[PDB]
Amino acid sequence: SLFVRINAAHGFSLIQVDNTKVTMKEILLKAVKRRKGSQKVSGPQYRLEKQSEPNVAVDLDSTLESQSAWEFCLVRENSSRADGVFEEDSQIDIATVQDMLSSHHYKSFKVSMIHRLRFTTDVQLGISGDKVEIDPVTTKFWIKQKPISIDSDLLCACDLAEEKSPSHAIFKLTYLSNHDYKHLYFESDAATVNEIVLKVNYILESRASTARADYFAQ
Amino acid sequence: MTEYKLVVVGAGGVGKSALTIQLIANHFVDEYDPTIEDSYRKQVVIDGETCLLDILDTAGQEEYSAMRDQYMRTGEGFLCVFAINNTKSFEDIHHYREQIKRVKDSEDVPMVLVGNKCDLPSRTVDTKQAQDLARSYGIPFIETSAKTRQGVDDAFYTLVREIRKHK
Ligand SMILES: Nc1nc2c(ncn2[C@@H]2O[C@H](COP(=O)(O)OP(=O)(O)NP(=O)(O)O)[C@@H](O)[C@H]2O)c(=O)[nH]1
Numbered sequence: 029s030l031f032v033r034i035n036a037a038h039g040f041s042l043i044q045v046d047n048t049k050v051t052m053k054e055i056l057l058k059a060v061k062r063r064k065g066s067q068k069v070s071g072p073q074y075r076l077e078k079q080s081e082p083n084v085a086v087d088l089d090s091t092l093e094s095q096s097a098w099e100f101c102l103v104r105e106n107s108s109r110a111d112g113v114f115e116e117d118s119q120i121d122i123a124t125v126q127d128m129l130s131s132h133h134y135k136s137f138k139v140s141m142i143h144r145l146r147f148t149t150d151v152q153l154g155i156s157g158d159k160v161e162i163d164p165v166t167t168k169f170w171i172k173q174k175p176i177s178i179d180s181d182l183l184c185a186c187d188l189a190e191e192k193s194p195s196h197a198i199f200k201l202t203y204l205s206n207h208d209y210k211h212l213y214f215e216s217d218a219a220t221v222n223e224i225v226l227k228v229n230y231i232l233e234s235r236a237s238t239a240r241a242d243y244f245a246q
Numbered sequence: 247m248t249e250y251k252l253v254v255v256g257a258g259g260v261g262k263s264a265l266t267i268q269l270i271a272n273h274f275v276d277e278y279d280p281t282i283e284d285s286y287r288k289q290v291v292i293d294g295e296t297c298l299l300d301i302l303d304t305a306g307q308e309e310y311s312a313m314r315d316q317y318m319r320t321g322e323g324f325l326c327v328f329a330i331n332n333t334k335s336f337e338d339i340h341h342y343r344e345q346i347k348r349v350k351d352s353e354d355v356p357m358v359l360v361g362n363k364c365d366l367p368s369r370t371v372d373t374k375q376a377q378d379l380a381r382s383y384g385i386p387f388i389e390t391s392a393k394t395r396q397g398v399d400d401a402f403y404t405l406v407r408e409i410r411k412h413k
């Protein structure tokens with residue numbers, strides 16, 4: 029699932045789209061019905077403009093991929109973007125907004141899991157609003173790692189333990205394991221770790237009932 | 247020109263988007279298109295003062311709960327909406343006020359309790375119970391119907407008044 033922001037003269041509308049194959053005309057149609065309540069075309073027709081290119085009408089038959097953008101201006105054909113009140117600079121940038129809206133979305137990361145503070149194993153870390161899965165990636169000279177699934181309701185904390193350089197960072201994942209709290213350490217580049225830590229923290233501020241007991245103990 | 251920033255919160259499907267559009271476009275949206283986030287400006291005269299209403303229509307779905315921390319700091323008043331036919335949407339009001347008073351770090355935040363869908367004959371939430379909740383939290387309680395437009399204007403205007411008393 030993908031998200032675009034539609035800026036109008038009287039506010040913004042966040043629109044969910046299936047994929048980038050969706051036509052800009054369909055996106056227009058959804059925005060107008062949301063802004064005005066009804067799908068009624070009405071006396072004024074409306075146009076979509078890329079946020080980066082003012083006063084220019086988007087090809088409505090073009091795909092959303094054709095536009096290399098996720099923010100668009102909804103403007104009546106008779107008027108201009110400058111006649112409205114919105115299209116503001118206090119609003120959060122679109123990439124951060126899409127990141128917040130996609131927290132529960134499943135995403136996998138290739139990171140290294142640290143064991144006994146002296147060893148590493150390459151794991152691919154699948155995270156979603158449902159669960160966090162830790163799986164190996166590609167036998168007489170190798171035992172694979174036991175696959176581990178942690179239900180999201182068992183998660184207590186996911187913090188950045190250390191950041192040394194853009195290629196090295198460590199984060200700690202705490203969770204409830206049979207009335208006891210286990211801690212998992214992972215290592216990757218700073219950008220990857222920052223995304224993981226932020227993604228889980230979005231999920232944690234969505235659920236409860238075990239983190240609070242952990243924080244009470246702290 | 248005083249600007250009041252209003253935020254409509256509540257569980258999914260209770261009619262947050264329908265009430266907001268009823269205020270803005272003055273018609274009833276029968277479709278249930280789940281909200282991510284939407285903002286609307288309306289100019290209105292309340293108690294002799296012309297006011298610019300900045301209305302924020304938020305998501306009832308928990309997948310988009312990460313947006314709640316941003317819109318709860320900036321908002322001045324909050325329209326806490328439940329549906330009279332959805333008992334838990336009433337029970338979920340406790341979570342929404344607690345988060346609002348937590349993010350705002352205050353005990354006295356302009357708020358109005360709204361029981362929507364009062365046109366339906368399938369009421370499951372007591373008006374005594376809902377009135378008792380609002381009294382316990384010290385906020386006005388309004389019943390509304392986005393279908394019949396009952397008390398739609400009163401619900402939003404009362405919140406503006408609650409914001410105005412606060413200052
Ligand atoms: N009978 C009746 N139906 C209503 C009323 N208000 C809303 N509805 C209906 O309830 C459904 C949900 O309304 P909607 O405004 O989308 O709810 P929401 O709280 O904004 N949902 P979400 O949080 O996902 O955005 C729609 O089908 C709408 O027509 C009302 O007062 N009466």
Ligand SMILES: [Mg+2]
Pocket residue numbers: 262263264279280281303304306
């Ligand atoms: Mg809605």
